[PDB]
Amino acid sequence: ADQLLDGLNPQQRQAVVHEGSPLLIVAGAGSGKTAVLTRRIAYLMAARGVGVGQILAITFTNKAAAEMRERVVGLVGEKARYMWVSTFHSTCVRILRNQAALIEGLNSNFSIYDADDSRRLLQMVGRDLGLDIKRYSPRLLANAISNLKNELIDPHQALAGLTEDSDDLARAVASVYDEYQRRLRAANALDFDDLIGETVAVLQAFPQIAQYYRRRFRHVLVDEYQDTNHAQYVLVRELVGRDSNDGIPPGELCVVGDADQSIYAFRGATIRNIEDFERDYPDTRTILLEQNYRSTQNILSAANSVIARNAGRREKRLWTDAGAGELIVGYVADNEHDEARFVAEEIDALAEGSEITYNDVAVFYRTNNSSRSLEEVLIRAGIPYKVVGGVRFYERKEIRDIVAYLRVLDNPGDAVSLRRILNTPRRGIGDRAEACVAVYAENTGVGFGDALVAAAQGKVPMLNTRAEKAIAGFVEMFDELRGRLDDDLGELVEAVLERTGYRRELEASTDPQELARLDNLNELVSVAHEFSTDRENAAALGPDDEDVPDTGVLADFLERVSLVADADEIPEHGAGVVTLMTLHTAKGLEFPVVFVTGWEDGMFPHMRALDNPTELSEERRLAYVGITRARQRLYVSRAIVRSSWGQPMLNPESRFLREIPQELIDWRRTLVLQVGDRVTHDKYGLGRVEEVSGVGESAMSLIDFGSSGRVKLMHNHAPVT
Amino acid sequence: ADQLLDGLNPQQRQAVVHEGSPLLIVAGAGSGKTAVLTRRIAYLMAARGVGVGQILAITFTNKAAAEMRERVVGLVGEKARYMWVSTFHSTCVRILRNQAALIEGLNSNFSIYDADDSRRLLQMVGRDLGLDIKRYSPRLLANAISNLKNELIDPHQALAGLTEDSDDLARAVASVYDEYQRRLRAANALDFDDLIGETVAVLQAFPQIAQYYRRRFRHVLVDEYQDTNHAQYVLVRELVGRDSNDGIPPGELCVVGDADQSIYAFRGATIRNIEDFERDYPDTRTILLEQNYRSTQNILSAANSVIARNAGRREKRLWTDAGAGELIVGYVADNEHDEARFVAEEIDALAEGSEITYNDVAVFYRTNNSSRSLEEVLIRAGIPYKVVGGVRFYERKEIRDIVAYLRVLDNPGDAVSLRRILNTPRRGIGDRAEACVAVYAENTGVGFGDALVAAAQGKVPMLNTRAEKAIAGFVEMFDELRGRLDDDLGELVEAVLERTGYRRELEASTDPQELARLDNLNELVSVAHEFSTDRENAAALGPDDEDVPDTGVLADFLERVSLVADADEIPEHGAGVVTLMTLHTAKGLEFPVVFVTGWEDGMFPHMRALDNPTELSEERRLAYVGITRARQRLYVSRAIVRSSWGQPMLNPESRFLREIPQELIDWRRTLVLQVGDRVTHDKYGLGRVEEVSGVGESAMSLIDFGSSGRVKLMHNHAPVT
């Protein structure tokens, strides 16, 4: 035992004790679902005495499985030798290896392939059939293959649908899927994704192995049921089907999860999986967890109100016995820089109370592109910062490629930078560096390694016609960029993008990672333009021709970028450090004080979600899971104007501000025209801001025009650029 | 409180409760040191109420640290966020990175270097100074650098020792050490080993950082103290020293371990570290754990007897309250194959009792080369087997290189095999540094797979003179080797080894890995000779072939090796699979029934240990840790004769047999001359064995000579080849 029971609310007590028929439970926002799961496991071991080699608890991530097994051992004892707690892929590969030689055509010594090996195989497929660089990018093909496999589509029936849709791209992807599957089976190995589908197919087709495994299993559990797509759901249903002994011994399948925290639909997860769980299993019982002890009442009520606006959702009201807690102090800034300044100021003010260190404060943003400005202020005020699930803004690979292109554009003498960006966009015809083409410097240090003009003329005789034409095009593009050096450097970056074809490839890939890369690079363009403007107005005034040749030459810009990059001496979490991350990786963590940035429509609800209802609901659930990360203090920030593509866009407040309980007016309390900043107006000329006063859109800015005097103006109605 | 105490013998009770002054405890063989450690930690937290952010527990491997953290979480709570339980390297690197901005020249942006980058850098250094292809192999240099650094040797004072020893090699290694260290610091990076020394140096040199960290830490825990070399011991002593306020704030130290299980001296661990622990800490107390619950009394007594003969050892007698258990089966075989047959037969017989499966039986061998025969019989009787800490015999890289050499010698048109062996047996100046030469010949030319011969005459003009000189010698020596196909297979393999320089460079490196590789190569030669005998003369003569052979080529050997290369088709630990491993990786595991192979002097007491007393004592401790792995059955096997390096050697019984008292070993049980095997005698001619009777030295073999009749003879006194 009763010690496991007399410490919990009766809801989880009844969830633990109940054993007849399959069970379902809704895990509320931080309602200790892991604790309830392990306590139920201990009660199962102590009362029903389940076989240690028969009980199966499965998860999706290694950390959760490790924590579950550790807590079970600390609660009931060390029996992990026969007790199994693993993830889907680990359990699947272990079970398949147990019977890996009983399948004809599939070697029991099969290996695994990463993305590079699959890319090589698919490029061989394409060069056998077509061309994998125009409209047939390897990443798009791989993603399509994985998504089609995730729905249990056999290669033999895959070619039966190409004529049904009557789409050329559909026919091409079906044919390449069939070829890839057959030549991968000819390669006596598989990838990291098709193993689940192949295991399901083998268990369905071979009856004796299915009967043996059904005899081998009696209990099956599962966690975070939302992420389970169709394929793993089918696997679990087949591995828990009660047709072996007709249920003479009970088959315990209880599922923990909550349909309202499903944010991983980008990997193919289906929200229908749990919402129609009752339809698949008519003999199930459901129970809700409406109580949690992690957050305060105000934040909990706000999250519950914001999540209830979806149309099709199971009713669930959260509550807690703790205090009301502090309010939700929203903020409105002049721009992203003003917002970063505000959040840095608030972090510093709250840290100077000796109650919580920097390690107790977390900041969330929707996308990586909205992470530069914050870092800047966080590197200016001196407060240490660390980012999880990624790298610094200047440390990402796309901005690295762009700055390397700029470095090459500065002087031709660079070698590492030029060698890194030779084949960064594959481009097919236009540049090529595989098959030891990149190593062609004649293996002799004739001057410095460039070739190029030597490569175009034919210094290296091993280079075929295609490669020499590609290198000639590359050097002609380089010469054109050299000759274009006449305008502002932001337009220079845009010209680089349009010449190199990076932007078109990024937009046509149509992947969340590639979309993030595109937005990040566009933000880099905006940063370059902002630096150019700041140097041109505040510092140049009369720019003429200084020691720095032009207004926005790459010398000073690259020097600034490098010196900011060479500043990683900031201490890590050894001392009090602040944490940064994106919303998609915020699941499973806990923090007492949280800030959220970019809380306006258009940005937080992306244009990809403004139309499709599924994406709208998914991002609303994402906002819910972001909100419920706080414990006692949660702050929201929005920016009236933000720069993108080198232009200032206007974005209203998000529709999520009204969904939150209005309560007292809290969003206006506690591009940009800061002290010393110079801006331009089409009718008034140039002006320098003197004083910054007010909070939110109520702020009126005083600008001295020099000869034309001082004028006080607004920010949204005055056409200031 | 008292619950942690009223379940244990009073020895560990007193070890747990005792808290004043530093404490030392001797952890007996399987005395549950981890459980006692975690219970003491829980009692420390509950009674003394030590601060969570001040208590430090350290380990050396991730698995043990994870287990200890699991026990802590399941026993005291989830305060793991403020207490660090990690390895030496991880904790040290985190500590140095937290304060990484307070050291000039060293910045936190440094990237750790694997063996590849260090190898490249030192190769460039050698090119600058000497030549790394002869007498200056990168592996030997890296090992020497790591070993010299492990003893806290400053690079500046390293120049002062080169003139003292007056050795050219010593001066060279000191100079390259200094050059490598300064060039690496110019590269703002460090290797995986110098981090400990750098942390020690920084903590010693900078007083304020040392004072801050001394104020930060209050408790320090360590496990498996034997592996602690001099450098990490100095680090621990400095991090626990009371020099912050000149002894005002005391330190807490409790050290677990056992000087009699120290087998990792090959990595530089010092047995003097624990045996002289009292000298450095005169105010400590020691306590022994003479009781364990894992093994039976007979095996425990055998281990106690065998470990007692070391002259310098703390007195420790193991005992247990369990039953006497079974005896010890000491088997003597005719040769290696006979021993493998015996162990397979015993495994099968013991498995057919439904008491234990194949997962409860483990077999140990001193070196990898003593596994081949075993695998063979384990693939013949059908019992599945898996290997921990390595791969199958035919899956290792050295035998892979030699079999690839053989395959290329068979088919001159092979491509993958020829491309793998060009540079992997590092020759460089010998054969070639780079890899892609076919692309020089018009990508592939007119199917020019064998472009090497065209490159020898120098048809490709873009290659340097040194590379073509190296390639010409390679192709000429390969052609010369191809013209000697009129000998036996074993002599052919030995000729390949001596011509390719594999043997000399593998021998001269003087490291355990390369010694294992050399022994592996000799075992491969023995296998080739055995197959040649079985296919050419033995069981291959008579009216069927007479004196004229059947055009016996190496293709038969190649196809046999390829066919038996399917040993990875065996299932992994998901089924009833037996385990194979070497002695050095047997620490920390547990198994019910164990077998040990190769229990003769010259093999188990290695040739490197017959002279040096330190190696002799170390291998005796290795025998102790191997013996104490059993739980209820431990069987020892030895072979009177064995083939090594292509020749049959005679090795007596090891001195460890007489070490165990000759009343607890159930002696005997129920190159070789097996049924159907043909052998040769210089005086009697050829003979075919009919009946195999007896075991070991009591066995007498009956051989029919055909025309000369049947004769019964012995094995050790009849010169049979």
Swiss-Prot record, chains A, B:
GO BP term (any one): double-strand break repair
Disruption phenotype: Forms small colonies, liquid growth is unchanged. Increased sensitivity to UV light, mitomycin C, nitrosative and oxidative stress; a double uvrA/uvrD1 mutant is even more sensitive. Single uvrD1 mutant is strongly attenuated in late stages of mouse infection, the double uvrA/uvrD1 mutant is strongly attenuated at all stages of infection.
Ways its activity is controlled: Inhibited by EDTA.
Keywords: Acetylation, ATP-binding, DNA damage, DNA repair, DNA-binding, Helicase, Hydrolase, Isomerase, Nucleotide-binding
Induction (UniProt): Up-regulated during mouse infection.
Residues the record lists as binding ATP: G30, S31, G32, K33, T34, A35, R294
Domain of life: Bacteria
Occurrences of domain UvrD-like helicase C-terminal (ranges): 297-588
Quaternary context: Monomer. Interacts with RecA.
Function field: DNA-dependent ATPase, acting on dsDNA with a 3'-ssDNA tail, unwinding with 3'-to 5'-polarity. A minimal tail of 18 nt is required for activity. Also highly efficient on nicked DNA. Involved in the post-incision events of nucleotide excision repair, as well as in nitrosative and oxidative stress response and possibly in persistence in the host. Inhibits RecA-mediated DNA strand exchange; this does not require ATPase activity. When combined with UvrA greatly inhibits RecA-mediated DNA strand exchange.
The protein's name in its UniProt record: ATP-dependent DNA helicase UvrD1
